[PDB]
C-alpha cells in the first residue's frame, strides 16, 4: 500500500518539475544586461546606541521612523529615540532568554517571546504611568522564534515545533493553526495588504499561506541547507531568502520557481539577515564574518561593504521612508548608517 | 518656543532616571554565574518549557537552567549558551547485556566539543548510576565486552584510588569509561578549555554544590593565569 502512494508522489513530483521547466523561456541575467550599474554605495555611521549588557538578539522599527525597540539576552527590552539618542523606556522580563520582539503599527503595544514557550504582550499607554504586562499567550510546545502584528487584536507566531499559529488577544485562543512543515520554523514575513504570508523552515523549503482560509498554496525549494531569513519585495510579488550555505536567492510567485542566486567564492559563511530598500534595487545581507554586504538585486554583483562590528551580526532593519539602516550585533551595540 | 525647551528637559530627566536604574542593575548582573544542566529530575533537587533554579554557596550566587521542554533537534537553541561558565553533563552507565547508550553520549559530547560557538566552554562530567555497573558485573556476562571489544586488553592505571569494598572489575570498568571520555577531549583543545570528571551514585544535597563550586574556581583561576603568561 505504501509503495503505490510513493509511486504516485514520484509521478506528481515529475509532473511539477516538467511544468516548471516548460515556462523557463529565458533568465533574469539576459534581459537585464542593458541597465547602468549603480556604482559604489559608501555609507557612514551617524549614531551609536550604548547601554545593553549582553548580546542584542532582535530589533524592530516603528511606523513613524523615529522610535525603535531592542531586545537583549540579559532580560531587557529598551525603547529608544533615534534622533536624540535618549532612552524612552526600559522594561524587564521574567525570563532572560528572548528571541523576538515586535512593535504595533498603532504605537501602543509591544510583544516579546523566547525559550519559555509563551508570548507576552505589554501595554504602553499606561494612564497610571507604569508599563505592565497585559497578556500572556500559551499553547505552543516549542520555543517561539518570530511574531508580527496584524492589528491591535490579532497576532501571528512561529514555533520550533513545526507549526504556525494565529491568535486573538481579548480571549486568548488559537483561531487557526498552520501545519505541514518538517523542521523548526525560523522566520516569517507579512505582505503589504495582510492577506498572505511566507514561512521558512529548517528543511530547505519555504511555504506560502492564506490567512483567512488556513491551507498552504505553494511550496518553494531550491536551497541546500537551512533557511534563516526571508523578506518580501515591496510590491508583494517576489521574496528573497538567506540560508546557511552562503547563498541568497530570489523567488517569484506567479512563475513558481527561482530567478537569481547571489553568492561568491570568497564567502564560506552563513547569512543571518536580509532586507530590501524602498525601491527594491539594493539588497542588504548580514553575515557571520562580522560585516554586512550590499548587493545589486538586478545584476548579482556586489556593490558595497559595511564593516564596523567586532562580533557576529544578528539583526538588520530598514525604515519606512528609506532614510537610514540599523544594525545590531553580539557586541551589544546598535549602529545607524546613512549615505551622503 | 517654551514647549521645545520643556520637551528637552523632560526627555533629559527620563534619560537620567533610566540610566541610574541600569547602572544599579549592572552590578547584580556581573555578580552571578550562569550554568547549563544537560542530560542524555533527581539531581536538580540535590542542588514549563525551561526551569530555573537559584542557589547560593559561600555568599556567591549560582543560576541553573534545565531545558526539558524542547525537542531532540538541538542545533539551533544550543547556540544561545555561548557565555556560560560551565556545562553540566550527566550520563548513565550500565553493564548488563537493548540500545548502546554510551555511544550516543560520546557522540553528543564530541559534537559539543568541536562546535564553533562553544570552543571556549568547559565541561563538568557526572558518571551517574555506578550501582548498576556493580549489579550487572556479577551476572558473568560482560555487556562492555559485547559492545567494546578493546576492553580485554586493559589494565588499571597506577594512580587508582578505589573505594574500600569494591570488586576490581567495577573499578576497571569505571576507569575505562573515564579514559574513553578523556581521549576525545585531549585531541582538539589548544589550551582554552578542559574537562572535569566525577563519579556519583543513583544523593548530592551537600555534595554537588561543593564540587561545582571548586570546579568553577579552578576554571576562572586558569583563565586569569593564562592571560599573564604564567600557564
Amino acid at each position, epitope marked *: 500500500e505504501l509503495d503505490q502512494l510513493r509511486q504516485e508522489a514520484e509521478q506528481l513530483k515529475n509532473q511539477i518539475r516538467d511544468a516548471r521547466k516548460a515556462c523557463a523561456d529565458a533568465t533574469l541575467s539576459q534581459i537585464t544586461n542593458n541597465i547602468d550599474p549603480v556604482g559604489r554605495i559608501q555609507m557612514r555611521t551617524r549614531r551609536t546606541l550604548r547601554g545593553h549588557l549582553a548580546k542584542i538578539y532582535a530589533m524592530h522599527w516603528g511606523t513613524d521612523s523615529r522610535l525603535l525597540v531592542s531586545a537583549s539576552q540579559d532580560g531587557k527590552l529598551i525603547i529608544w529615540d533615534s534622533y536624540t539618542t535618549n532612552k524612552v523606556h526600559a522594561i524587564p522580563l521574567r525570563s532572560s532568554w528572548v528571541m523576538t520582539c515586535a512593535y504595533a503599527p498603532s504605537g501602543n503595544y509591544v510583544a516579546c517571546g523566547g525559550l519559555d514557550n509563551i508570548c507576552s504582550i505589554y501595554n504602553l499607554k499606561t494612564r497610571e504611568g507604569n508599563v505592565r504586562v497585559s497578556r500572556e499567550l500559551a499553547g505552543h510546545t516549542g520555543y517561539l522564534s518570530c511574531c508580527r502584528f496584524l492589528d491591535d487584536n490579532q497576532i501571528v507566531t512561529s514555533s520550533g515545533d513545526t507549526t504556525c499559529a494565529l491568535w486573538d488577544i481579548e480571549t486568548g485562543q488559537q483561531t487557526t493553526t498552520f501545519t505541514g512543515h518538517t523542521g523548526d520554523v525560523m522566520s516569517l514575513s507579512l505582505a503589504p495588504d495582510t492577506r498572505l504570508f511566507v514561512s521558512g523552515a529548517c528543511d530547505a523549503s519555504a511555504k506560502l499561506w492564506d490567512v483567512r482560509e488556513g491551507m498552504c498554496r505553494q511550496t518553494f525549494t531550491g536551497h*541546500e541547507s537551512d533557511i534563516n531569513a526571508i523578506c518580501f519585495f515591496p510590491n508583494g510579488n517576489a521574496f528573497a531568502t538567506g540560508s546557511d550555505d552562503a547563498t541568497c536567492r530570489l523567488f517569484d510567485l506567479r512563475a513558481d520557481q527561482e530567478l537569481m542566486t547571489y553568492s561568491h567564492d570568497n564567502i564560506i559563511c552563513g547569512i543571518t539577515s536580509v532586507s530590501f530598500s524602498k525601491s527594491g534595487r539594493l539588497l542588504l545581507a548580514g553575515y557571520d564574518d562580522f560585516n554586512c554586504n550590499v548587493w545589486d538585486a538586478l545584476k548579482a554583483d556586489r556593490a558595497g561593504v559595511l564593516a564596523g562590528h567586532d562580533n557576529r551580526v544578528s539583526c538588520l532593519g530598514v525604515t519606512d521612508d528609506g532614510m537610514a539602516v540599523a544594525t545590531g550585533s553580539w557586541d551589544s551595540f546598535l549602529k545607524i548608517w546613512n549615505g551622503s | 518656543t517654551e514647549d521645545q525647551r520643556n520637551e528637552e528637559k523632560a526627555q533629559r530627566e527620563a534619560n537620567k532616571k533610566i540610566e541610574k536604574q541600569l547602572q544599579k542593575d549592572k552590578q547584580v548582573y556581573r555578580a552571578t554565574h550562569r550554568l547549563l544542566l544537560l542530560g542524555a529530575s533527581t539531581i536538580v533537587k540535590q542542588m514549563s518549557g525551561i526551569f530555573e533554579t537559584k542557589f547560593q554557596v559561600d555568599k556567591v550566587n549560582f543560576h541553573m537552567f534545565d531545558v526539558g521542554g524542547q525537542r531532540d533537534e538541538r542545533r539551533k537553541w544550543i547556540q544561545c549558551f555561548n557565555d556560560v561558565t560551565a556545562i553540566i553533563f550527566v550520563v548513565a552507565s550500565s553493564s548488563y547485556n537493548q540500545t548502546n547508550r554510551l555511544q550516543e553520549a560520546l557522540n553528543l559530547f564530541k559534537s559539543i566539543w568541536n562546535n564553533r560557538w562553544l570552543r571556549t566552554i568547559s565541561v563538568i562530567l557526572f558518571l551517574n548510576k555506578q550501582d548498576l555497573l556493580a549489579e550487572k558485573v556479577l551476572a558473568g556476562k560482560s555487556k562492555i565486552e559485547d559492545y567494546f571489544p578493546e576492553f580485554a586488553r586493559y589494565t588499571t592505571p597506577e594512580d587508582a584510588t578505589p573505594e574500600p569494598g569494591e570488586d576490581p572489575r567495577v573499578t576497571r570498568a569505571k576507569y575505562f569509561i573515564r579514559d574513553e571520555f578523556l581521549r576525545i577531549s585531549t585531541a582538539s583543545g589548544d589550551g582554552r578549555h578542559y574537562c572535569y570528571p566525577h563519579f556519583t551514585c543513583a544523593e548530592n544535597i551537600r555534595a554537588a554544590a561543593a564540587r561545582i563550586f571548586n570546579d568553577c574556581r579552578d576554571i576562572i583561576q586558569r583563565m586569569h593565569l593564562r592571560q599573564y603568561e604564567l600557564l
Partner: nanobody
Amino acid sequence: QVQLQESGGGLVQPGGSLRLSCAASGFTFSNYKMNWVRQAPGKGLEWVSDISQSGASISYTGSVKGRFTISRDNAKNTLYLQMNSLKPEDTAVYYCARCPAPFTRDCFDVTSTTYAYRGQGTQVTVSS
C-alpha cells in the same frame, strides 16, 4: 531538492558478504561529511559508521569493527559500505545520512523526529 537513495539488500546466510550503495542528488557532494545509520526491529536508531570530506578520517562503532568497510567516490557521487562475515544480530533497515551544514566538524543527525536529510533505507536479513 535534496535526495538520497539506497540500493543493495536482501537475505544472506551467516558468514556471507554483501554491498550497500548510496546515490545522492541536489547538493555539492564533496563538501559534506557522510555516515551510515541502522534501525533494528523493536529498537531505536543507532550510529554505525562515518567518513569525512576527503577520506582521511574514518570511524566505526565497536561491534562492527574489523568486518565492515566504508568508502566514497566523489566523481560519481556515491557512498559504499562493504559487509563481511555477517551474524544473525545484524538484521535491520539501513539509512544513508548527511550532516546539516558544510565545512564543519560536528553533526546532530540521529534524531527520530523526522530528520530531513536521509532516505528510506534498505532491508538486510540474515538467517538459515
